[PDB]
Structures are given as structure tokens and as C-alpha cells.
Amino acid sequence: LYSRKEGQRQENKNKNRYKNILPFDHTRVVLHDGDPNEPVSDYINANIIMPEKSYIATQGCLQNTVNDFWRMVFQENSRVIVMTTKEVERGKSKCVKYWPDEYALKEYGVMRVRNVKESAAHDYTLRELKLSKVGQGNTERTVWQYHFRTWPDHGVPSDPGGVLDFLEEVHHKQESIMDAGPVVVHCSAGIGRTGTFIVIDILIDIIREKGVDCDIDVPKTIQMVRSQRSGMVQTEAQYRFIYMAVQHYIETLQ
Ligand SMILES: CCC(/C=C/C(=O)O)=C\CC[C@H](C)C[C@@H](C)CC[C@H](O)[C@H](C)C(=O)C[C@@H](O)[C@H](C)[C@@H](C)OC(=O)C[C@@H](O)/C(C(=O)O)=C(\C)C(=O)O
């Protein structure tokens, strides 16, 4: 009940930044209505992560997966994107530029993206973009891209403050959009940094509906998200960052 067949198919080998980091088939994001000329067009390295508000854990775009990325965003109806990495860190590409330059607009396949406005904050940049299907400007929607950019080249942030203030914002943005789709989260492989944010965001929403006293079980939550995408949270720094984040959030509310 836990296969990764599709991700291993010969035709999707170029659609993964790491041959060894693949999506489970049951939680795999299936892409419909793609170019009928392509051998396979229903694939993208991304999994739906639903607590048990949903999330989409994926890798940063590859030069050849950018259109797939937007098709996913359009289909799933996502309205918020969380980029947890720079395009390149320590001379290594983690995500290709998949959004247009300021005030510009590009067409990625059948998807038109207009960069409406870019605004900076301490740890991140917010990009207001308009997504629509070419020729059908009756499908346009705004997608808010939250680009975290101060994450350290090595290890994790020494203080959770930034990430928390960041996620509070992403949070209210998501709840201000009527029935917005899953929140897309992505880093280089979509498991390490990506898992950490999601796990944190998940635990924080609990402390929201519940109170600063509810039963919080980190290992259980992590285990839970890993059953939907393996690798979620890969380092000890990340692991401990989650604990710190949660405690910091608690102490903040007080
Ligand atoms: C935009 C560039 C381009 C187009 C060029 C063109 O216009 O023509 C094409 C990209 C080609 C291609 C997809 C990329 C190419 C470099 C080769 C693919 C990988 O580079 C390769 C498997 C590899 O060998 C990488 C590893 O050496 C890697 C560092 C290892 C130690 O490390 C990890 O596995 C990353 C991991 O620690 C990690 C992270 O914190 O980055 C994770 C999980 C995370 O938090 O997300």
C-alpha cells in the first residue's frame, strides 16, 4: 500500500531532481489534460499532504518541469505558494525561476502568468501573480507566492521567530481566499526544508483550534506526514527546529 511506481517510470526520470527521491503513488499529484504528444504528462514530483487545510509538498522547478508546476497549481486551485529556498544556494540549483520578472508576464505552456507586484519583508518577498489559461481569461486567479530567502546556507535558523512570523502571514493569506486549494510548499527536493515548514504549520494550526495546552505529539505528526511523502524532515537541526518553533509559538501567545 506504499508504491512509487509512477515516479520510477522511464519517462519521468527527467522530471525528478533526485532519482532516489520520489512520490508515493496514492498521494501523488496526478496531472490531467496535458500535451497529448508527450509520452507521459500526468506526472510531477509532488504529493498532497493532508493533516489527520491541505498542502502540496514538491521540489523546486526543474527547467523542464516549470509548465507541469503551473498546471498543478491551476488544477489543484492553489492560491498560495511557499518557496523555502533561493533559486541557487551554495552554487547549487534548488529551483528554476518559474515566475516572470517584475511587472512582466510569461506563458508557460497553456498557462499565462502575470507578475502584478513584488513586495519585500524581513525574511521574505511576496509576489502577487495572476494565473490563467491562455485564450480563456475566465479562469484567472491570483496566486500569492511567499518567498522565504534568509534561510541559512548551513543548518537551520538559530531562532524560530522568522519562520513563525512568516507562517502567520501565509496563514491569514490562505484564509482570506474563498475555498483556496492546497498550500504549495517547495525546497530543493521537497522533503527536508519543505517537511519542516509543513510539520510546523500543522502543529501551529492545532495550537490554534485547540489551546496552548492540547496534546502535541511531534513524532506522530512527522510519521503521519511521511506516510504521504517519505523523507519529510531530514536533519536533526530541522527536527529540533520544529520543537523550538512550537515552544516559541506557545510562549508568544502568552
Ligand atoms: C537550471 C539548470 C539546468 C539547465 C541547464 C540548461 O539551460 O541547459 C538543468 C538542471 C539539470 C539537473 C536537473 C541538475 C544537475 C545539477 C544534476 C542533478 C543533481 O545535482 C544530482 C542528482 C546530484 O548529485 C546532487 C547532489 O550532489 C546533492 C548536492 C546532495 C549532496 O545533496 C542532496 O541530496 C540535497 C539535500 O541535502 C537537500 C538540500 O539541503 O538541498 C534537501 C533534501 C532539502 O532540504 O530539500
61 closest CA partner among 167, 133, 126, 145: 145
Distance of CA 79 to the CA centre of its chain: 11
- Tell me whether residue 205 is exposed, middle or buried, using C-beta atoms within 10 angstroms of its C-beta: 0 to 12, 13 to 18, 19 or more: middle
State the Cα torsion 99-103-109-111 to the nearest 10°: 90
Q: How far apart are CA 163 and CA 170, in angstroms?
A: 10
Q: How far is the CA of 59 from the centre of ligand 1 (A)?
A: 10
Rounded to the nearest 5 percent, the helix, strand and coil shares of the chain are 30, 25, 45
Query: Does any ligand 1 atom lie closer than 6 A to the CB of residue 187?
Result: yes
Q: What is the DSSP string of 4-36?
A: -HHHHSGGGGGG-SSTT----TTTB-PPPS--T
Q: How far is the CA of 62 from the centre of ligand 1 (A)?
A: 10
What angle in degrees, to the nearest 10, is found between the helix axes of 192-209 and 236-253? 20
187 is known as an active-site residue: yes
187 closest CA partner among 79, 60, 91: 60
Residue written as grid cell 495546552: 213
Residue-number span of the structural domain to which 104 is assigned: 1-254
Residues sharing a CB contact under 8 Å with residue 145, sequence separation 6 or more, in sequence order: 80, 81, 83, 99, 126, 127, 128, 129
Q: Residue 251 is part of a domain; what is its CATH number?
A: 3.90.190.10
What angle in degrees, to the nearest 10, is found between the helix axes of 192-209 and 218-226? 130
Question: Domain count of the chain?
Answer: 1
Q: How far apart are CA 225 and CA 55, in angstroms?
A: 10
Query: Does any ligand 1 atom lie closer than 6 A to the CB of residue 93?
Result: yes
Question: CA–CA distance from 17 to each of 64, 143, 190, 230 (Å)?
Answer: 11, 24, 10, 15
Q: Are 186 and 84 in contact (CB under 8 A)?
A: yes
